[PDB]
Amino acid sequence: GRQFGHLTRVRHVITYSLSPFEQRAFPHYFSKGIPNVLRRTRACILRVAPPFVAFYLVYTWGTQEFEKSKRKNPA
């Protein structure tokens, strides 16, 4: 295990904190929240979306072929 007081070394760093009864738990939830969600999705969409679009195209083609491959031809 590991304990507080034996983790690492830190110097010259100040932390200011406020009590949770002095502040609001939902401050600017929609005012600042939505623009941050847009930035987060914008920053990662190009890395996540393409492979799942690639899956979507294979999925529709493969079923479209199979769904009609067992249709009959005049010959």
Next chain:
Amino acid sequence: AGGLEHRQLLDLAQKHFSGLSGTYDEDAVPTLSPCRFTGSQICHREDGL
């Protein structure tokens, strides 16, 4: 405070402190406003101490 009669101290006050500003001060009094107390925390981390 010490070995001294209050008469003497008042005589000296009326002598050497009469030149002070009167009771009125031209409407500019310091009125201490209440001071908000805030539950909060400040940590200055310094492991070299």
